[PDB]
Design a protein around this ligand. Structure first.
Ligand SMILES: COc1cc2c(cc1OS(N)(=O)=O)CC[C@@H]1[C@@H]2CC[C@]2(C)[C@@H](OS(N)(=O)=O)CC[C@@H]12
Ligand SMILES: COc1cc2c(cc1OS(N)(=O)=O)CC[C@@H]1[C@@H]2CC[C@]2(C)[C@@H](OS(N)(=O)=O)CC[C@@H]12
Ligand SMILES: [Cl-]
Ligand SMILES: [Zn+2]
Length: 257
């Protein structure tokens, strides 16, 4: 029942998830001038060619596209990562207005939305064991701004009508996540946490500098989703983002310049 309302939102989370006030919480504001280029970073490798999407689900907080991670298919490697991280699902965070919606911010700038591609470290066997490790997860974050439509996102947009309410799912096979990436893989990276309860601090965040553009019509359809379940009073699924948290002396590294 945690959520993003005044009575169950981010300001209430710490009561049931004390780690909310931890030393490595996400998201964070990325101060571009303080971020330092890191020559030790290896080339980032996004290998999504064999990705196998399975289903899309409205979980009452956002919608999630799940993938078959039983085998080494869609993986993320390189960059700040040691080993291989398998893609398990992706989801978005968005606002009720174009001027807000992203979780991470850049020089305090809020984007209209933010895409999160969640991966787990294969050395830990499964996602559950991975979230018990300081380097168990890697989330690739991509900012969304409103402008031209993103063709590779339309398939997702058109299926949202079938998963309007919490608990609803639908078959979503053969979706290629590569169509959601921008041209450049320039990124910022830092150690953080899940941005929703349980807020576990097991994530290596990789946030791309170049945002992707989506049309106003596409994001408007994100905003037609419901936080509520079928047969309940409608509460539009908007502003499902957690604000920036204290950096706490962590350092944000840049893969460029
Ligand atoms: C409790 O620990 C786990 C959670 C999840 C998985 C494996 C887990 O480890 S376990 N039980 O030891 O195998 C495998 C599937 C995962 C799910 C957690 C919730 C996920 C990430 C879903 O995202 S959601 N619906 O937004 O919460 C999509 C796939 C789900
Ligand atoms: C510990 O395993 C879980 C993780 C998550 C959920 C349920 C889980 O199982 S359990 N035992 O019921 O707590 C439900 C919400 C999920 C979260 C894992 C991180 C997710 C996928 C978040 O991803 S993010 N924003 O990149 O951190 C969005 C929803 C989050
Ligand atoms: Cl509300
Ligand atoms: Zn997220």
């Amino acid at each position: 029942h945690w959520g993003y309302g005044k009575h169950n939102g981010p300001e209430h989370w710490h009561k049931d998830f004390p780690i909310a006030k931890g030393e490595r919480q996400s998201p964070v504001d990325i101060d571009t001038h303080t971020a330092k280029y890191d020559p030790s970073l290896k080339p980032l490798s996004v290998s999504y060619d064999q990705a196998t999407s399975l289903r899309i689900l409205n979980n009452g907080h956002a919608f999630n596209v799940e993938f078959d991670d039983s085998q080494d298919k869609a993986v993320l490697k390189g960059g700040p990562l040691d080993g291989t991280y398998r893609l398990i699902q992706f989801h978005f965070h968005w606002g009720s207005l174009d001027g807000q919606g992203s979780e991470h911010t850049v020089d305090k700038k809020k984007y209209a939305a933010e895409l999160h591609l969640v991966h787990w470290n294969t050395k830990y066997g499964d996602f559950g064991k991975a979230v018990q490790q300081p380097d168990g997860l890697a989330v690739l974050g991509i900012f969304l701004k409103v402008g031209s439509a993103k063709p590779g996102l339309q398939k997702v947009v058109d299926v949202l009508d079938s998963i309007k309410t919490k608990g609803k799912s639908a078959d979503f096979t053969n979706f290629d996540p590569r169509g959601l990436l921008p041209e450049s893989l320039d990124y910022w990276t830092y150690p953080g946490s899940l941005t929703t309860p349980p807020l576990l601090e097991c994530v290596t965040w990789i946030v791309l500098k170049e945002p992707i553009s989506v049309s106003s019509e596409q994001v408007l359809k994100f905003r037609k989703l419901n936080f509520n379940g079928e047969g309940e009073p409608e509460e539009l699924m908007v502003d499902n983002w957690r604000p920036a948290q204290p950096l706490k002396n962590r350092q944000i590294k840049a893969s460029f310049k």
